[PDB]
Design a protein around this ligand. Structure first.
Ligand code: FAD
Ligand code: FAD
Ligand code: 6T2
Ligand code: 6T2
Ligand code: ZN
Ligand code: ZN
Lengths: 228, 228
C-alpha cells in the first residue's frame, strides 16, 4: 500500500488551493491510498519556535536554546503534542505533498512554522546525517504551488526569475536535506487571471498527474537542476 | 539625520543574535541615529495571515481572500494595529536591518509572518509599483544572518551550496520587490562552534561595519549576482 500526507496552507476552503487539495484527496483515495490532510489554518498551527514546544519543564533554564532543547525533547519524546502528531504523520507517509500559495517567493509563514518545528534535529536529520543521509530517506515529497505571477514572469528573462530559483531552499534546503527524493513541482500559475476553463484545466491536470504519481522518477535535486 | 529599524528574531536575549542586535543599537545610537527594534518573539508577533488582520467587517465574509481583504483594509485604514505599528516604523526608516538565525535556509517563521503581514499591497508595493518602482524605494535593507554551517559549507562546492543561492527569495523576491536597495549581507558563520574570543571578534566586526554603513553601495540585486 501507499500512505500520503498533504500539508495544506490556505485559509479558504473554496479557494483554488482548496480545490487542488480536494482533487488530490479524491484521486489518491480512489487509488486506495491512505490519505491524511494537515489543514494548518484550520488547526490554528503555532508557527513560532518557542519554549512551549518542549513539555514538562519544571524550571526554565536561565538561557533558552531552541535547537538544543528541541533535539533533547525529541529524544525524550517530550515535544508538544501538535509537533509529535505531525511527526507521526510524516513518519508513516510514503509521499508528502505540500499545497500552498506562494508568499514572498516561499511558503506562507504558517507552513514555514510547520517546517521549523516539525522537521527537528533527531527526527528529520542529524548532524551529520543530512541530504542523502537524512532520516526521511525512502520517502517522496512534492510541492504543489499556486502563484500570482504568470509563467512568463517566472522565467530567467522575466522580472521574477526562473521558478526553479525560488524552489532551492524548499526542495533542496528543506526536503532533500531531510533525505526526501523530490518529485517535480506542480506549479499552477496565475489562477486568479485565468479563465474559468483554464482554471478547471489546471485542476484536472493535477488530478491527471496524480493518476500516475507512483510511476514518476524524482528530479535530480541539484544546483544544476535549479540554476543550470 | 537617519532612522534605522532592526527587525529582530531570536528567543533569547543572551544569544549571539541578541549580542549582534545590541551592538547595532549601541553603534547606531552613538552615531546619533534614531533606532527602533522590533523584538518579534518578545512582542509575540502573530505570524499567520488570517482575517484577524482586518479590523471590523470584511468585504466578503463568506469567501475569505487574504490578498483582497488586506489591500482594501490598507486603503480603508482598517488593518490590525500590530501591522500598522510595524508599517509606521518601516515608512520612517532609512535602513531596515533583519537580525536572525538562519532557519531552513530562510527566516524563522515569526519573521516570515512579519514579511507576509506587514509588507502588504498598497503599503510596500503596488501593481504597477514593484522592484525598482516599489513603494519603499529610496530605503536600504540589510540581512544580518547567523548560521549553523561554516563558511566552507556555504561555498559553491560546500555541502549547502553558495550562500547567495538561498538569499534570492529574501533579497530579491521580498526586499528588492518592495523597492529597497540591498546592502551586502552580514553572515556570521557558525558562532556555536567558535571560541568565545572568535565570537567577540564577529560582534566587533559587525560593529565596525556599522560605523561606515552609510558610505556603502548596494549590491546589484540581480539573478546574476545570486546565481552567476
Ligand atoms: C502575503 C502574500 C504574498 C504573496 N507573494 C507572492 C509571490 O512572491 N509571488 C507570486 O507570484 N504571488 C504571490 N502572492 C500571490 C498568491 O500566490 C496568489 O494570490 C495565490 O497563489 C492564488 O491562489 P488562491 O488559491 O488564493 O486563488 P483563488 O483566488 O482562490 O482562486 C482563483 C479563482 O479560482 C476559483 N476556483 C477555485 N476552485 C476552482 C475550480 N475547481 N475550478 C475553477 N476555478 C476555481 C476561485 O473561486 C477563484 O475565483 C502573494 C500573496 C500574498 C497574500
Ligand atoms: C529550526 C532551525 C532551523 C535551522 N536551519 C539552519 C539552516 O538552514 N542552516 C544553518 O546553517 N543553520 C541552521 N540552523 C542553525 C541556526 O542558524 C544556528 O543555531 C544559529 O544561527 C546560531 O545563532 P544563535 O544566536 O542561536 O547562537 P548562540 O547559541 O546564542 O551563540 C553561541 C554562543 O555565543 C555566546 N555569545 C553571546 N553573545 C556573545 C558575545 N558578545 N561574545 C561572545 N559570545 C557570545 C552565547 O552565550 C552562546 O553560548 C537552524 C536552527 C534551527 C533551530
Ligand atoms: C501581473 C499579474 C500578477 O502578477 C503577480 C501578482 C503578485 C505577485 C507577483 C506577480 N510577484 C510577486 N507577487 C506578490 C508579492 C508579494 C505580495 C504580498 C502581498 C500580496 C500580494 N498579492 C496579493 C494578490 C494580488 N492579486 C497581487 C498581490 C503579493 N504578490 C496579473 O497577471 C500577472
Ligand atoms: C557541522 C557544523 C554544523 O553545521 C550545520 C548545522 C545546522 C545546519 C547546517 C549546518 N545546515 C543546515 N542546518 C540545519 C537545517 C535545519 C535545521 C532544523 C532544526 C535544527 C537545526 N539545527 C539546530 C542547531 C544544531 N546545533 C544543528 C541543527 C537545523 N540545522 C558544526 O560546524 C558546522
Ligand atoms: Zn537537492
Ligand atoms: Zn533583486
Amino acid at each position: 500500500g501507499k500512505k500520503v500526507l498533504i500539508v495544506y496552507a490556505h485559509q479558504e476552503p473554496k479557494s483554488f488551493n482548496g480545490s487542488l487539495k480536494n482533487v488530490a484527496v479524491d484521486e489518491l483515495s480512489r487509488q486506495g491510498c491512505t490519505v491524511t490532510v494537515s489543514d494548518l489554518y484550520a488547526m490554528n498551527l503555532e508557527p513560532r519556535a518557542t519554549d512551549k514546544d518542549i513539555t514538562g519543564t519544571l524550571s526554565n533554564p536561565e538561557v533558552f536554546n531552541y535547537g538544543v532543547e528541541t533535539h533533547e525533547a525529541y529524544k525524550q519524546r517530550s515535544l508538544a503534542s501538535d509537533i509529535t502528531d505531525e511527526q507521526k504523520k510524516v513518519r508513516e507517509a510514503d509521499l508528502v505533498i505540500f499545497q500552498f500559495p506562494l508568499y514572498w517567493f516561499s511558503v506562507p509563514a504558517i507552513l514555514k512554522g510547520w517546517m521549523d518545528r516539525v522537521l527537528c534535529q533527531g527526527f528529520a536529520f542529524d548532524i551529520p546525517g543530512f541530504y542523502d543521509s537524512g532520516l526521511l530517506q525512502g520517502k517522496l515529497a512534492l510541492l504543489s504551488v499556486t502563484t500570482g505571477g504568470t509563467a512568463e514572469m517566472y522565467t530567467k528573462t522575466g522580472v521574477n526569475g526562473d521558478s526553479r530559483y525560488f524552489l532551492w531552499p524548499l526542495q533542496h534546503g528543506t526536503l532533500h536535506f531531510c533525505g526526501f527524493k523530490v518529485l517535480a513541482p506542480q506549479i499552477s500559475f496565475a489562477p486568479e487571471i485565468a479563465s474559468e476553463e483554464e482554471r478547471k484545466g489546471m485542476v484536472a491536470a493535477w488530478s491527471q498527474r496524480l493518476q500516475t504519481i507512483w510511476k514518476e522518477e524524482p528530479i535530480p535535486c541539484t544546483a544544476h537542476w535549479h540554476f543550470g
